[PDB]
């Protein structure tokens, strides 16, 4: 179908460039990264700071181009502890210009009743699964295994 077909060339034309996230509260960086996270079907990792999870609050900015023009730039990710979905986020870019290169700043805050567990537990055993989309148009699913140091 043409849906299947146009997903893959969103893909195509897909880059993620760099990625960083700060202390929401006091705008220090607690990670910054040039790997493509987004690249599906390879398990990537990234070492994040035990710190993160004092966070009440984490301010991420993610840096991407793409050659074709999205509608309704989207992503859905979820936080699986041990296979299990303990958290599912949504976050929304909009409208992309095809050939543009673009700065998404989201900000992430656990639900308020959730108490964190310790990093020496979660570690290696977190994976985040992001999910890419242009409206309802699935583009890429990408996972990330989490260590925390
Ligand atoms: C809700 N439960 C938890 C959630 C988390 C998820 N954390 C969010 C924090 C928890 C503390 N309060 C503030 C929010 S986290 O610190 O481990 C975290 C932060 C950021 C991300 S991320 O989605 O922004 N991102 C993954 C990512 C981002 C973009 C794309 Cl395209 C692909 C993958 C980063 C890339 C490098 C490391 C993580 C994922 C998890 C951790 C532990 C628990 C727990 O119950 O023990």
């Given at each position: 179908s043409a849906k299947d077909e146009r997903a893959r060339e969103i893909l195509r034309g897909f880059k993620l460039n760099w990625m960083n996230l700060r202390?929401?509260?006091?705008?220090?960086?607690?990670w910054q990264g040039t790997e493509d996270?987004?690249?599906?079907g390879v398990e990537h990792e990234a070492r994040v700071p035990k710190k993160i999870l004092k966070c009440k609050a984490v301010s991420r900015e993610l840096n991407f181009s793409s050659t074709e023009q999205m509608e309704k730039f989207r992503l859905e990710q979820k936080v699986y502890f041990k296979g299990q979905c303990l958290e599912e986020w949504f976050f929304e870019f909009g409208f992309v210009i095809p050939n543009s290169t673009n700065t998404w700043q989201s900000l992430i805050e656990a639900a308020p009743e959730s108490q964190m567990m310790p990093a020496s537990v979660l570690t290696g055993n977190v994976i985040i699964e992001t999910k890419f989309f242009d409206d309802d148009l699935l583009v890429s699913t990408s996972r990330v295994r989490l260590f925390y140091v």
């Open positions: 202390d929401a509260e006091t705008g220090k960086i607690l996270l987004s690249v599906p």
